[PDB]
């Protein structure tokens, strides 16, 4: 249950300067790919990608580091080993709690109060506090699916390991019309429906 990390390389020789790095592990279908990026301000200048197997200058600033580090065999061997060591190690330790985390959505339906500013009569399915981010929201009017007149926000990341989304149906209600929002998400065994009736 301890995460492995990795030392960056120490490169060879109002007012603000910045240096940032990335050590990225891409997990896909039993495989791992490792990228290590070196970034000056917003300019990535050199990278190691395990799919290439050596350092590549991204930009001219990186020219000297590519040349030097690629003739260091011990360093190259350490970088080539990261997918099967650190990446795999960390991916394997997470278990279901990490790789299969689930948090069920809450679902609310109400008319938009914002007509004057939206210029459209919208019924809002606000779906909150869920994880992971993949979700499907469908609208029905008297039991028939409505596929025209549906608009959505982007999937919104709350920053607290949950998401929300607002899915809006443009409506022309008649008395007796019954609208249903149906939410499908992997945290749920069955879809969640919420009804709203035209007053």
């Amino acid at each position: 249950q301890a995460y492995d990390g990795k030392d960056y390389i120490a490169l060879k020789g109002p007012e603000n300067y910045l240096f940032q790095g990335r050590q990225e592990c891409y997990a896909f279908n039993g495989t791992q790919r490792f990228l290590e990026r070196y970034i000056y301000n917003r300019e990535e200048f050199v990278r190691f990608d395990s799919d290439v197997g050596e350092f590549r200058a991204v930009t001219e600033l990186g020219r000297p580091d590519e040349e030097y580090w690629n003739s260091q065999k011990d360093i190259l061997e350490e970088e080539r080993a990261v997918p099967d060591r650190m990446c795999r190690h960390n991916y394997e330790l997470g278990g279901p709690m990490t790789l299969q985390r689930r948090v069920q959505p809450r679902v609310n339906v109400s008319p938009s109060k914002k007509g004057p500013l939206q210029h459209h009569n919208l019924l809002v399915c606000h779906v909150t506090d869920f994880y992971p981010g993949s979700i499907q929201v469908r609208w029905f009017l008297n039991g028939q699916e409505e596929t025209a007149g549906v608009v959505s926000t982007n999937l919104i990341r709350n920053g607290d390991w949950t998401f929300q989304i607002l899915v809006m149906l443009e409506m022309t209600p008649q008395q007796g019309d019954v609208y249903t929002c149906q939410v499908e998400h992997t945290s749920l065994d069955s879809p969640v429906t919420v009804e709203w009736k035209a007053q």
């Binding site: 960056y8 490169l11 240096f19 940032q20 990228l35 000056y40 301000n41 506090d129 920053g159």
Partner: protein, 180 residues
């Protein structure tokens, strides 16, 4: 790159506060970071902190390497300073708003560079300092940053809020307004 999941260590060092940050994200959410002053690993979700660990001293060692690397690139670039890229700001509640029921207001500050900001919340034009929380400076794939600010509040018909943001790319403070 095709991926079921992306697990990323990201770190930065700069001249101005915060002068360093060292964090780990999993599918773009911050899992843990190293508090550089306490010298300790801080876990975002309590259950994760209870199940897993990370050696803070490897973070500290990497902040020292990155500081070496910064000194090198300052010299090699001839003291090139980047342009200031100002933030986009959105304010939104965490839950559907019900008057009189507790909720949380989120201020999302996006696409900015460098990671130097002042943010405050105002309620009815006055500063609010309690019931507030904030994320790290979170990395973006284009090497700019984003950040979240939070305010726990009870919505009411009469109140208005602003998220007030200062950044070097902005000519004056940006006030993003919200009301119930």
């Amino acid at each position: 790159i095709k991926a079921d999941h992306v697990s990323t260590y990201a770190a930065f060092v700069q001249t101005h506060r915060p002068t360093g940050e060292f964090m780990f994200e999993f599918d773009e959410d911050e899992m843990f970071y190293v508090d550089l002053d306490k010298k300790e690993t801080v876990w975002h979700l309590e259950e994760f902190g209870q199940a897993f660990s990370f050696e803070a001293q490897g973070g500290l060692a990497n902040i020292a390497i990155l500081n070496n690397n910064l000194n090198t690139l300052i010299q090699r670039s001839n003291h090139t300073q980047a342009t200031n890229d100002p933030p986009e700001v959105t304010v939104f509640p965490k839950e559907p708003v019900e008057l009189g029921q507790p909720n949380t207001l989120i201020c999302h500050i996006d696409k900015f560079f460098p990671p130097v900001l002042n943010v405050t919340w105002l309620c009815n034009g006055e500063l609010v300092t309690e019931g507030v929380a904030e994320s790290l400076f979170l990395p973006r794939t284009d090497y700019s940053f984003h950040k979240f600010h939070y305010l726990t509040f009870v919505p009411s018909a009469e109140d208005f809020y602003d998220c007030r943001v200062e950044h070097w790319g902005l000519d004056q403070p940006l006030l993003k307004h919200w009301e119930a």
